[PDB]
From a paper:
The [name]α is the prototype [name] family phosphatase for which the catalytic mechanisms and cellular functions have been well characterized. The active site of [name] is located at a cleft between two central β sheets, and it harbors a binuclear metal ion site required for catalysis. In the [name] [name] of [name]α, the M2 metal ion is directly coordinated to the primary chain carbonyl of the Gly61 and the side-chain carboxylate group of Asp60. In addition to these direct interactions, the M2 metal ion of [name]α also indirectly interacts with Glu37 and Asp38 through water-mediated hydrogen bonds.
To reverse the negative charge of the D38, we also made a [name] mutant to see the mutating effect. In addition, the electron density for the side chains of D38, A38 and the partial side chain of K38 are also unambiguously assigned in the [name]α-WT, [name]α-D38A and [name] [name] structures, respectively. However, in contrast to the [name] [name] of the [name]α-WT, the electron density for the M2 metal ion and the phosphate can't be clearly located in the D38A or [name] [name] structures. In the [name] [name] of the [name] mutant, the bridging water between the M2 metal ion and the D38 in the [name]α-WT was pushed outward by 0.7 Å because of the longer K38 side chain. The relocated water (WAT145) forms a hydrogen bond with the side chain of K38, which disabled M2 metal ion binding. Therefore, the [name] structures of [name]α-D38 mutants revealed that the D38A or [name] mutants of [name]α abolished the M2 metal ion binding by altering the H-bond network of the [name]α active site. However, the basic limbs of the D38A and [name] catalyzed pNPP hydrolysis were flat, suggesting an inefficient general acid catalysis for these two mutations.
Author numbering: 2 to 321, 327 to 368
Amino acid sequence: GAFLDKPKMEKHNAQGQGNGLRYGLSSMQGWRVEMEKAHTAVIGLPSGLESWSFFAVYDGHAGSQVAKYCCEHLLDHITNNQDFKGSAGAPSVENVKNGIRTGFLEIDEHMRVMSEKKHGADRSGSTAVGVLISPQHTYFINCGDSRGLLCRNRKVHFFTQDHKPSNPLEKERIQNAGGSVMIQRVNGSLAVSRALGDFDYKCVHGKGPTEQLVSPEPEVHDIERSEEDDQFIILACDGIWDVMGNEELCDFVRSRLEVTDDLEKVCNEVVDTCLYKGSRDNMSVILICFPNAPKVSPEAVKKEAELDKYLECRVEEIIKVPDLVHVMRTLASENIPSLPPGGELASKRNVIEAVYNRLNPY
Ligand SMILES: [Mn+2]
């Protein structure tokens, strides 16, 4: 077990701006009995990196301890090691990448020793996906099956590759570590091949830290920034990506940015939409907008109001007492034009439900 009888829709939001960036984020427990997600969102880093920013989403499993420790200390483990520092004044691309790798391996070992010392009872682990944004580069960081993407010139310019046990190189490591991949799971249990924590899967004698059943090793990609063309970055857990593809979500987010510049609201729209598309997991998303992110469009705002009015009239008529499920089903059969790209009817469910509720409050 572990599903609630009804989803917990409460949103935890944050927003901020600086270094030319604006961001919003939303997390929601949804159908799950526990919330095991965390995030980091910081504009302006310590120790001479004030023009830097860092954003990350951590999808915890078997507990929130690992995800919570990461969201508070991963960044310092990355920036405060000899690999990141190097190196004259400004960190080279190699310093940044090596520094991030060392940061992951060191925080993992750090947690392992803390747990050993205090006889920790939890056996939790966590994915991490994030971006370290410098004045000239965006470094995407991925460890696990959370995912991030960069929208540039209205297209998906880059997205992180999910670490899954069945991936060829992952399966190879797992087998060489004495394990197997059964369907999509390590030993028929873990659905992730890389994560922080999961120390029971990191006890293989004769294998280094990155050769275990589960690896803490991140994949890092440096993308040179384009002031003219960079639009936004989306970071989210698999609770989002399970039900929306890269291009769908990019298109959907664009469509929402053309209607509002409230980034928390856009993130809330993504999360609700994914819930309505059937996601039964915790959900978290961070949206980071660059200076040339899409701007609110008067025509887009009008089209949205026209659509909302149209849906309201349809609901009025369909009622003429069908439940909401049946009203949604009727609306779907109508093949209504001009729904949000990617979001589709699910992304309009809040509008529909609001009207339905005014008409059938009991
Ligand atoms: Mn998840």
